Design a protein around this nucleic acid. Structure first.
Lengths: 96, 103, 93, 80, 93, 103, 80, 96
DNA sequence: TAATGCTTGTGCCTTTATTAAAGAGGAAAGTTGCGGTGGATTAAAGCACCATCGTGCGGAGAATACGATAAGGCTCTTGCTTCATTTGAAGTTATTGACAGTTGAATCGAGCCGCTCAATTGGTCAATTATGGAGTCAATAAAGG
DNA sequence: CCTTTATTGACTCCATAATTGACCAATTGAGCGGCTCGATTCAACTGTCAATAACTTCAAATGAAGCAAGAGCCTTATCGTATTCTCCGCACGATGGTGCTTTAATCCACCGCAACTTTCCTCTTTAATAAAGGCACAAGCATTA
C-alpha cells in the first residue's frame, strides 16, 4: 500500500498550519484549566467569555514564539529534533 | 465656523486631540494649538503608511477587503513598522518561513 | 454613554489612499488600538521632556523632540516633514 | 477542579510546534511545555485578578486581561 | 540652590539596623538613586490605577494595589503588613 | 508641633513625600495623607532590607564600611531583590562563578 | 577623527572576556565585538545628543547619558 | 625552563578579573572613539568628563553580559572556544 | 527518467452574513473677550573645557615553539513517524433561574487654599580613623618524576 | 604520592584620605479655618453567566511496524597560548586662553476660563455583495524500478 517516508507529512503540516490563522487548542479544556488556576487566588470567581478568548490567543502566540526560538537553538547544535535543553537555553537567554 | 483640521489641511480632528492632551497633562500644565496640529499630522501620516502597505498586500491576494492577516503581513514585511509595532495581532498568524537545513 | 473612536477618520484616510478597497470591523478595531498606543507613547514622552527642562508648557518643539525619540529613522524624518508642513499651513491660514 | 493540565493534549502541542516551523519532537517536550504554560498563565491570571479585586467586582473582564498582558510587555490587539 | 536627597534618613535607618557600620559616599548615592526609582514606579502605577477606575483621588487603597502589582511575593506581603501597621498607628494617634 | 513621621512611627519624611506626590499628580488630582504614610513606610522597609543584607555581607569580609561591591553582592545574592533591581551598579563587578565544564 | 575603532586593543577585549568567564577565544571575535560596540554606542549617543539639542546647549551632560540609557532599559546607578 | 599548560593562566586571569571592580579599557582611546562617533550627529560638540565615564561603564557592563550569554551558547554546542556564530545566536534570541 | 497515487490550486454554484448606506439626537467644537502667567531677549561674570609641553615607564606589538581542541568519518540502535480501529468527549441547540453589574440620589467626610512660626535640613570646615602600598613569610597548587 | 617552583593569602607597619562631628543659615512643614467637591450607601432594573439535558460525529488513544537520526569512538592538522624582547604612547603634573553656561531683570504674547450656537459624530435599522463551504478537477510532487 501507499506509505510516506518520515518528515514528508511533517513538512505538509508545517506548510498547512503556517497558512491558517485559527486557534489550535480546544476551548473547553483551556477554560477549565484557567478556572482551576484562578481558584488558587480567589474563591468563587466568575469569568467573561472574551477574557478566556484573550488568554487563549496570548498563550498560543507565546508558545509559537518560544518554539521558534527553540528551533533556532536546536539547529545551532546540529540537530533537527528539539529537546527540553533547547527550551531551557532559550528561556535562560530571554531572561525568564 | 472653520474647523482647525481644514485650516491645517488634515483629516484627523485637532480639537479632540487638543482636549485629550489637556486631559492627560500633569499638575497645572498647558498645551498649545501647534502641539495638537503636529500630533494630528503625525497620526495621519502613520495611518496612511500602514493602510497603503496593507492595501497593496490585499491587492496581491486578489481580494477587495482588508483583514487582520493583511495587516500582519504588511507590518512584518517592513522593518520600520516591525520595530515600531511590537504588539500581537489577533488572527494574524505568522509569516511563512522554513529553514534551509530542514528541507 | 457614547464611546469615542477614530473609525470615521480611518475610513476617510483609507478612501484617500485606496478608493476601491474596504475594511472589516476587526481590522478597524486593531487600527484604533494601534493609534491609541502611539498617542500614549507621544504624550508620555512629551510630559517627561517638559519635566526634565523645567518648563510647564507643551509646545510643538516638545512634540518634535518626542517624535525624534520615539520613531526610527526615515519614519521620523518624514513625520517631521509632514508635521512642519501642517504647522506652517495652519499659521499661514 | 483537579488534574486539568492534562487536558492540553499532545496533538495540540504538535500543532503549535508545526506552526512554529518544527520538524521533529522528543518525548519530554509535552511535560516541559505544560509547565511553561502553567507558569505563564499563573503570572497573567494573578495580575488580572488583582486588577479585578481593586475595582470591587467579582467577574473577570477582558480589559483586566488586556492590562495584565500590557504590564509584562505582551501587548495584545483585537480585544481592547 | 539646595538639592534634596534622602541621605539623612538612610543614615538613620542604617544606624538602626547596624550601629557599628559606616557607609561611603558612592554607596549612599546609589541608594538615593534606587529609592528615587522605586518612588517613580509606585507613583506611576497609582496614577494609572486612578485613571482606569475613573477616580480622581489617590488613597491608601491605590497604594496597596500598586505595591501588590509592583513588588514580588514575600516582599509584597511584608511591605503590605508594614504599611497597614503604620496607617493604623497614624490613625489611632 | 508633632511631625507626621513621629505620629506614624517612621524615620522617613511624610510631608516631603506628600509634597512630591502632589507635584507628580495628573490633571488636578488629589492625594490623601494615608497615601503618604503608606509610601513612606514601604520606602523605609525596602531601605532597611537592603541595608541589612549589605551590612551582613560587609561583616563577612571583616570591614567596617559599605562600598558598591557589598551592595552588588547583597542584591545579586537575593532572589527578590534580584528581580526588583535590574539596574547597573557602578563599581560593583560581578559574582564570581566558573562553569564546571571549563575546569 | 578617523580609524579610532582600532584603539580598542585586543588585550582589552581579552580582559572583558575573562571577566565574563570565557576560557578560549577565536580570531574573528575582536572584529565582531568592535562592530557590536559601535552599534551600541551609536544608539546611546544619538539619544543623548537629541536630549542635549532640546535643551539648547552645546555640551553633553552626564544626565543626558543617564536618560538615554534609561530609555532603552539599561538603567545605571552611580552617576545620577 | 618553567612553562604552564594552556588554560591554566587563563583560569588564573578568570579568577583575578572576576574579583576586581576596575575599568578594563583605556580612557583616552575610548574618549576619542566616542568623539568620532558623535561627530556624525552634530558638528563641534563638547563633552563633560563624567559623561564619557558613564558611557564607558555602561559599555563594559553590556559587553560582559553579552560574553556570558555567548559562553552559554558555546557550551551548549559542546565547545570551549567562542565563535562569532555564538554571538550572533545570542543577539538574535535577545531580540537585537 | 517514469507511471502512478495523492494531495493541492483553480473554476463554478450557493447562500449567507457582513459591510455599506440612511436617520435622530445629543454631545462637543467653534467664537469672543479678559486677565495673568510663562517664554523669549540681553548683558555680565565665572567656571569649565580645550590645547601645549615634558617624561618616563608600564603596557602593547611581533615572533616563536607547540600542545590541545575542533572537525570529519563510521557504526548503530533506539526512539519517533505513519496508518487503522474503536471510542469518548467536545461542539451545537434550546431552556431556567438567580446573581451580580450598572445607574440614579443623598450625604457626610476630607482635601485644598492661605499666611505665620519656628524647627529642621543643607553647605562649609578640621580631623581621626579605616584603608591602600609595600615588604615578608608561610601555605597551596601545578608540572615532571 | 613526592619535589621543586611559582603564586597568593596572612601579618605588620606606614602614610593618607575620606567619613564624622560641629556650626551657620534659609526653607518649608505644621497649624487653624472656610468651603466645596468626591467617595460611600441604598434601592431598583436587567444582562448575563452557570447549570441541565439530548445528540452527533469527529478527533483523540492505543497498537503495530519501520526507518533514520543522535550518540559514541577514533584520527588529524592547525591554531590559539604562554614567553621574551623592544618600543611607544598614555597618564600624571602644571599652565594659558576663551567660550559657553547660568542668573537676573524685562517685555510681550498667548492660553485657560466662561457662556452661547450649531453641526457633526454616534447607536439603530436595512440590505447586497464579497467570501467561505462544497463539488469537480488538472497538475505537480513522491515513490519504487
Amino acid at each position: 500500500p501507499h506509505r510516506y517516508r518520515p518528515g514528508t507529512v511533517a513538512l505538509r503540516e508545517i506548510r498547512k498550519y503556517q497558512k491558517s490563522t485559527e486557534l489550535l487548542i480546544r476551548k473547553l479544556p483551556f477554560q477549565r484549566l484557567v478556572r482551576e488556576i484562578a481558584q488558587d487566588f480567589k474563591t468563587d470567581l466568575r469569568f467573561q467569555s472574551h477574557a478566556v478568548l484573550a488568554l487563549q490567543e496570548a498563550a498560543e502566540a507565546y508558545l509559537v514564539g518560544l518554539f521558534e526560538d527553540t528551533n533556532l537553538c536546536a539547529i545551532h547544535a546540529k540537530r533537527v529534533t528539539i529537546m527540553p535543553k533547547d527550551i531551557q537555553l532559550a528561556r535562560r537567554i530571554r531572561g525568564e | 465656523p472653520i474647523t482647525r483640521s481644514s485650516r491645517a489641511g488634515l483629516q484627523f480632528p485637532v480639537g479632540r486631540v487638543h482636549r485629550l492632551l489637556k486631559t492627560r497633562s500633569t499638575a497645572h500644565g498647558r498645551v498649545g494649538a501647534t502641539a495638537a496640529v503636529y500630533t494630528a499630522a503625525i497620526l495621519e501620516y502613520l495611518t496612511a503608511e500602514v493602510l497603503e502597505l496593507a492595501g497593496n498586500a490585499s491587492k496581491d491576494l486578489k481580494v477587495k477587503r482588508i483583514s487582520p492577516r493583511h495587516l500582519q503581513l504588511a507590518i512584518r514585511g517592513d522593518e520600520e513598522l516591525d520595530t515600531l509595532i511590537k504588539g500581537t495581532i489577533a488572527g494574524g498568524g505568522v509569516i511563512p518561513h522554513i529553514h534551509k537545513s530542514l528541507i | 454613554k457614547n464611546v469615542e473612536t477614530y473609525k470615521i477618520y480611518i475610513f476617510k484616510v483609507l478612501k484617500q489612499v485606496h478608493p476601491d478597497i474596504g475594511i472589516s470591523s476587526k481590522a478597524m478595531g486593531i487600527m484604533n488600538s494601534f493609534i491609541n498606543d502611539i498617542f500614549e507613547k507621544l504624550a508620555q514622552e512629551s510630559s517627561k521632556l517638559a519635566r526634565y527642562n523645567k518648563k510647564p508648557t507643551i509646545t510643538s518643539r516638545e512634540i518634535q523632540t518626542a517624535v525624534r525619540l520615539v520613531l526610527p529613522g526615515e519614519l521620523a524624518k518624514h513625520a517631521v516633514s509632514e508635521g512642519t508642513k501642517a504647522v506652517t499651513k495652519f499659521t499661514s491660514s | 477542579l483537579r488534574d486539568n493540565i492534562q487536558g492540553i493534549t499532545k496533538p495540540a502541542i504538535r500543532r503549535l510546534a508545526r506552526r512554529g516551523g518544527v520538524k521533529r519532537i522528543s518525548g519530554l517536550i509535552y511535560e516541559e511545555t505544560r509547565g511553561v504554560l502553567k507558569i505563564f498563565l499563573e503570572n497573567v491570571i494573578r495580575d488580572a485578578v488583582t486588577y479585578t479585586e481593586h475595582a470591587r467586582r467579582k467577574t473577570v473582564t477582558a480589559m483586566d486581561v488586556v492590562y495584565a498582558l500590557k504590564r509584562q510587555g505582551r501587548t495584545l490587539y483585537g480585544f481592547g
